[PDB]
A paper describes a structure:
Specifically, β-catenin binds to the cytoplasmic tails of cadherins and to α-catenin; α-catenin binds to β-catenin and to filamentous (F-)[name]. α-Catenin has three major domains: an N-terminal β-catenin-binding domain, a middle (M) domain, followed by a flexible linker to the C-terminal ABD. Single molecule force measurements of the cadherin–catenin complex binding to [name] that employed an optical trap setup revealed that the complex displays catch bond behavior, wherein the interaction with [name] is strengthened under mechanical load.
This construct deletes the first half of, and thereby destabilizes, the short H0, and binds 4.5x more strongly than the complete ABD (residues 666–906). The helical rise (27.4 Å) and twist (−166.9°) of F-[name] in the reconstruction are practically identical to those of bare F-[name], indicating that the ABD does not induce any major changes into the filament. Compared to the unbound ABD crystal structure, the N-terminus through the last turn of H1 is disordered. A key part of this change involves the long loop that connects H4 and H5, where the first strand of a β-hairpin becomes a two-turn extension of H4 (residues 795–801) that forms contacts with [name]. The CTE past 862, which is disordered in the isolated structure, forms an extended peptide that interacts with [name]. The backbone carbonyl oxygens of αE-catenin K862 and P864 form hydrogen bonds with [name] residues R28 and R95. αE-catenin K866 forms salt bridges with [name] D24 and D25, K867 forms a hydrogen bond with the backbone carbonyl of R28 and contacts V30, and L869 packs against [name] residues A26, P27, E334 and Y337. Finally, we note that the CTE sits between [name] and the next ABD along the long pitch of the filament, and V870 packs against V800 at the top of H4 of the neighboring ABD.
Numbering used by the authors:
A (entry chain E), C (entry chain F), D (entry chain H): 4 to 375
B (entry chain O): 698 to 804, 811 to 871
Write the structure that this text describes.
């Protein structure tokens, strides 16, 4: 009769809700803001920190910090503030009545998961908790059990190949290029238009620019060439102040970092080439099913036209005798949440939590021999 | 814009009911800017602002009563900050109404608009401290001092929020 | 049960009263007059200095001096005379029974505030005192917490942008053009009509001329053009002697110095252009709320039609996609006092005074780490 | 047998000379002055604009404008006046006989460089021109090829890490805090002494104050503490009028903005923290050579004692097992010029200009695929 709580603590958007549901009830950016000015009024000077949407509304007077950068957690005193805002202030449930399910990118440091379950037990007193891999839940949300997962969140971009039940942990390819690096490259590439976005409160504005304008070209060279004859690729976006900005080739040079990471100096391969590189790390028998089942979770795979370029860029690398199907579900931004609503509400799961009586005798090291 | 936040019932019996009174008097106060409510001149807006000032002082009293028994920082500092905000807003409204009344009886739309903006900030502060007092009460219900005030989590009429749209 | 005293020591009008009230009880011009003639009668020759309205009534036989020029205080021996007249002679209270609140223009010299609190402690023996910024109290009086303040008093004209509680001290723009310079420019521009006002007792008369006649045109060039066809813009004002004077374009060339300071040779921008210049020093997120909340305290914003020209002159500089609302309250001349009646009577303020026991151990340098 | 012209068009000081030389022949402030008064004499009223030192000599009667603010050029009609004064009036050469080399801060708008080379070709008719990055020439002047460059000019402050030949364009950190902002903060902080510098002709005087008085403390807190016991840190400077001024802690609060940009409200890091932030953006192998080779060009690194504080403030951030050497050459104010005298006179360079026959067929877009 009790329900389970699920909380995808992403790098840019904390999503949370109840198990068995079909949509997250709370979604808010995981920002902690400190005020940085004097505060001359005698009231409204005691509020020392702001979290979530009330920091997103007041971002002009706050230094903004994400506690999660590239999947790992660098500030625990802000992460417990964000979780305390998540459970009480927006979900309005007590943690002691519901078991909780958290989300972790693969190949993370063990100290991150250890301090995460220690904070979840010895501060909020949950009955039971479970941390799951951020990519294995995307296959639950897609309805499948085979396929490789290209989860490109805000922090990290990881490819996990999973045949029917069984993952292949020697082929989990985690690349540190994601939406925050595209946001910083859009800050760097909008300087050539004349616009200077320097503070951390303008990162939100250029993130909104990336939201509503940036698409990815099917072919990059000729689309770059037609931007020289600047006639139809410019687009105007209105700022919060009122000034309009015009954007030309910067509209599609920003997602092209996903397929050419040498633009920001990263010695790596693009997300089309590490996918074929990661399928080739697998065995030759399951390679046919992994080629034909390519799910894409994460918000950074919500650019207009990333499925077409992903298919076109794999099919020049794969052998040309069997098809590639980049299956891109339309709700994929919340996809990591949706599988979290499945696995927590599944009937055969309830003897695979981490109970509090199992934690206090074995310490926080119980989370490694239970989850992965 | 707190009518979507003011989804409650007549329960709570000390905090929620005056919050609903302040919400309906804001909803009838800011209708004067559209000019189709029961407010005609400017002096009834002064009486309305005096009503919200007295109700904000009473809410400040009740918020001070709940804040004594909260043990440490985690929500008590937030509650004290919103209490200082609602105290500043109500005390500014109180003797900002007086100067507008004395301007009225010694000699015409923006005069209402300043009190409207003050009431809007007061209402945002009061729904913020309603949320913070809910968190502070249902966080520490086993703690001693909270149990004597007799405010269980059932008495608050806060439901779970809406399903967020997955697409668009 | 005790009340607090508030005393806005302006450059042209000392206003004073009790906290919690709605109007100042004492308002009088801050003039100190020395007699300058022989005094042949054997009585009425011992009264060495006159202050306030009894100097304003007898101004023909007195050299008149304002102790405050451009916000700073240049004559302390006259300023203590004005404060001694304020507390005892017109408010009729003792300073030792009431705490006091004084007013200071921003970006003033520190020695001014230091000698001000030293005079307030070691001469009048107040229990506690506080000095507040002249512009932050105008937002208390307007009922708001966001917006920029264009406080144009008699001494200085300062623009202070304040988002909800938090000021932005790097955008406080203080310009030394105010009502006294408009009075001197009206003395200079009335010479072309034939009228010569040379002494300091005629500055009061031309100030009254500025009071009852001078308005500000919405458009300056065509209003200057219609004054050439001199038919309806002349106005007659009666002097204290009985001679009438006719005023044509001098009726609106005097407030136009507020929007074109090159008339009196000041290398600056007008109060329409330093406002948009000061909003653009702020951050791009709060710029929308600062454009739409433009309070105007100070007596020099009580010209007939300054709100319309301020709105029309900002909206040619601001982006045209969101509105400008120059909110001009009708009691704005006393507005700096009204917020002073708020902040001193506020319940959460009483642990933010400067007590006498806090002053004697730390000296007069305690006022910098308490007020700003 | 022909020589090349080099012209560092800085934000506060245009420097220019011939290639192969060791010192600039012309150095003058890049100011354009319009007269702002009546001009009652019948002669001396036709000279409509003044540039360079003849505007610096007559600055009391001129509105002064810098055409370059924060690296970009905001007034082309004044910049062509400054270049026309540079070539003809002070260098006394024709532009058609010498190829020219101009200087550009990195991460500038492309339209700035485009209009710069269009003005250099279609107005002065140079045989060939080249624009170079303002920081890569400082390593030529320092004699090195590895190291990071902290070029803090008058407009911008940019850190560029360059290993032996190869720059790292993903770590070019450009911060908009430089000597003009320190000059404005010195104008703002000298108001507390009582001195008011309001017009644009007093910016030159307070710039001279910054020249001859302002040093930077090794430790800021105890040096601030010893300024309270005001005995040995005051210094007197004589104005052009004759009034002397005394300066206490304002002598070292002005360069401290370089290491704490929160004083002027800039959400950024100081030049000690963006340097370690920019070295950490590089790769782990070249980090040892970049730590030990820290050149400092630009005039704003000519404060007395900035090398000691830069070393002390990096070595608290860097790992303590290998040394930091802030190499500060004594001629560093002209350092950007000196490398410009190297690279233009280098024998292997002369097939990497932009000839006029290469420009007219490809338009002004040839400058992007030649310089960076
Ligand atoms: N429609 C979209 N187009 C482009 N980018 C998007 C879109 N939706 C989301 N994003 C990017 O994805 C991020 C959404 O957060 P997300 O990474 O899904 O959270 P989590 O870190 O939990 O996976 C945002 O930072 C944004 O940059
Ligand atoms: N009704 C009015 N019309 C025009 N000017 C006014 C009016 N009332 C006041 N003033 C101007 O404003 C000044 C009033 O003093 P004020 O500046 O308000 O004091 P403070 O310096 O304390 O702000 C006078 O010098 C006068 O020039
Ligand atoms: N001796 C010095 N001490 C302190 N600051 C200096 C000194 N010399 C120059 N400066 C600063 O450096 C600037 C000199 O201009 P500079 O930046 O060298 O021109 P450019 O912009 O071409 O590099 C001035 O604005 C001044 O602030
Ligand atoms: Mg994520
Ligand atoms: Mg004043
Ligand atoms: Mg320079």
């Amino acid at each position: 009769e009790t329900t389970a709580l699920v909380c995808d603590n992403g790098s840019g958007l904390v999503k949370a809700g109840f198990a068995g549901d079909d949509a997250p009830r709370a979604v808010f950016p995981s920002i902690v803001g400190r005020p940085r000015h004097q505060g001359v009024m005698v009231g409204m000077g005691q509020k020392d920190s702001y979290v979530g949407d009330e920091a997103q509304s007041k971002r002009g007077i706050l230094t903004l910090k994400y506690p999660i950068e590239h999947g790992i957690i660098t500030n625990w005193d802000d992460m417990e503030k964000i979780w305390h805002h998540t459970f009480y202030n927006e979900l309005r449930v007590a943690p002691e009545e519901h078991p909780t399910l958290l989300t972790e990118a693969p190949l993370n440091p063990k100290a991150n998961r250890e301090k995460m379950t220690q904070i979840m037990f010895e501060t909020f007193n949950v009955p039971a908790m479970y941390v799951a891999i951020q990519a294995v839940l995307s296959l639950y949300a897609s309805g499948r059990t085979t396929g490789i997962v290209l989860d490109s969140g805000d922090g990290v971009t990881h490819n996990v190949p999973i045949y029917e039940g069984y993952a292949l942990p020697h082929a989990i390819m985690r690349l540190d290029l994601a939406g925050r690096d595209l946001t910083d490259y859009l800050m760097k590439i909008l300087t050539e238009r004349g616009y200077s976005f320097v503070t951390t409160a303008e990162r939100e504005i250029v993130r909104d620019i990336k939201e509503k304008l940036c698409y990815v070209a099917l072919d990059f060279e000729n689309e770059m060439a037609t931007a020289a004859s600047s006639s139809s690729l410019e687009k105007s976006y209105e700022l919060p102040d009122g000034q309009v900005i015009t954007i030309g080739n910067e509209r599609f040079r920003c997602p092209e970092t996903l397929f050419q990471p040498s633009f920001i100096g990263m010695e790596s391969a693009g997300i089309h080439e590490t996918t074929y590189n990661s399928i080739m790390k697998c065995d030759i028998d399951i390679r046919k099913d992994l080629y034909a089942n390519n799910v894409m979770s994460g918000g950074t795979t919500m650019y207009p036209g990333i499925a077409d370029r992903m298919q076109k860029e794999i099919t020049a690398l794969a052998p040309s005798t069997m098809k590639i199907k980049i299956i891109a579900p339309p709700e994929r931004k919340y996809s990591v949440w949706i599988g979290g609503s499945i696995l927590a509400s599944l009937s055969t799961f309830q003897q695979m939590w981490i109970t509090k009586q199992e934690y206090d005798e074995a310490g926080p090291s119980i989370v490694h021999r239970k989850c992965f | 814009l707190d009518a979507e936040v003011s989804k409650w019932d007549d329960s709570g019996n000390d905090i929620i009911v005056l919050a609903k009174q302040m919400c309906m008097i804001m909803m009838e106060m800011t209708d004067f800017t559209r000019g189709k409510g029961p407010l005609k001149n400017t002096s009834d807006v002064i009486s309305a602002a005096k009503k919200i000032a007295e109700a904000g002082s009473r809410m400040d009293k009740l918020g001070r009563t709940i804040a004594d028994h909260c043990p440490d920082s985690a929500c008590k500092q937030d509650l004290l900050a919103y209490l200082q905000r609602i105290a500043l807003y109500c005390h500014q409204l109180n003797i900002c109404s007086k100067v507008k009344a004395e301007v009225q009886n010694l000699g015409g739309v923006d005069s209402a608009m300043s009190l409207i903006q003050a009431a809007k900030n007061l209402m945002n502060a009061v729904v913020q401290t309603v949320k913070a007092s809910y968190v502070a009460s249902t966080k520490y219900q086993k703690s001693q001092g909270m149990a004597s005030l007799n405010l269980p989590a059932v008495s608050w009429k806060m439901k779970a929020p809406e399903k967020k749209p997955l697409v668009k």
